[PDB]
């Protein structure tokens, strides 16, 4: 009953038969910005189905020496389809997200992935006093990898990362994870090209292992923006 799930947004649909419920971040659901919290006075544009749809990123390969992968929202989607066009043509952005992580294998495979959404994951650098640069933080569609997943690349602990909204993909139990993220910012809206509200991190706490014939086991991320609204129409920045 709670193992199967279908998510339908816009013209996109995803079905899974090995889900383990799904997580709503802090028990919240995405919604449009109300009048009593609005700041910008211009009429926003709400493309709805044009932007509130699943976008599939490039898959990554789960290896034995893998340390983990991360993507930053809204940076990862800032140049994809109508959502990217609206971001490039508007100064202000606001939306939530629906993240679906897929990874299947055989019943002889073992491995556990922690799929965690981190709000305002300010990254630190290792063994230096210099702050991380712009290119180290903004990776776009490709995303980045974890240099030290044991400390979440920020001097904290991975063991305590469960305080953030998260799920687990355990190969013997489930093949997908689903997280619903509301808008999470100190301001009602933000400039989408210089600040990232969310960071999706997939970390292989239990390494992938099996004794069958080795096959490529990819991890796929599908992110659907939700309740998108954009303010400050002007020329495209790109």
């Amino acid at each position: 009953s709670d193992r199967v799930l279908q998510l339908k947004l816009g013209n996109s649909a995803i079905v899974t038969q090995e889900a383990a419920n799904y997580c709503c971040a802090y028990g919240e659901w995405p919604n449009y910005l109300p009048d009593h919290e609005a700041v910008a006075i211009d009429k926003p544009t709400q493309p709805e189905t044009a932007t509130d749809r699943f976008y599939t990123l490039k898959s990554v390969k789960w290896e034995t020496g893998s340390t983990g992968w991360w993507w930053k929202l809204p940076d990862a989607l800032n140049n994809i389809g109508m959502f990217g066009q609206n971001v490039q043509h508007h100064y202000l952005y606001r939306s939530g997200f629906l993240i679906h992580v897929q990874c299947n294998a055989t019943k002889f495979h073992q491995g556990a992935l922690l799929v965690v959404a981190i709000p305002e994951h300010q990254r630190g650098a290792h063994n230096t006093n210099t702050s991380p640069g712009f290119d180290d933080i903004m990776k776009g569609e490709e995303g980045g990898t974890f240099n030290h997943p044991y400390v979440l690349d920020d001097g904290t602990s991975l063991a305590c990362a469960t305080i953030f909204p998260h799920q687990w993909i355990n190969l013997r139990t489930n093949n997908s994870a689903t997280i619903v993220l509301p808008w999470m910012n100190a301001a009602p809206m933000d400039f989408p090209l210089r600040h990232n509200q969310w960071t999706l991190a997939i970390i292989p706490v239990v390494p992938l292992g099996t004794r069958t014939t080795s096959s490529m086991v990819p991890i796929t991320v599908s992110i659907a923006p939700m309740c998108c609204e954009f303010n400050g129409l002007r020329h495209a920045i790109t």
Binding site: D2, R3, A20, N21, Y22, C23, C24, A25, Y26, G27, E28, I163, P165, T173, V180
Partner: protein
């Protein structure tokens, strides 16, 4: 004792005993019943 004209000048407010740990412990769309297999 607050004789100042600004409300933020008052002392600390330690009388908020409202809690909601579920938003951190059970952030699932469908709740779980006691004893029943969750999965």
């Amino acid at each position: 004792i607050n004789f100042y004209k600004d409300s933020y000048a008052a002392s600390a407010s330690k009388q908020d005993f409202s809690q909601d740990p579920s938003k951190f412990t059970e952030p699932v769309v469908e709740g779980l019943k006691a004893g029943a297999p969750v999965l």
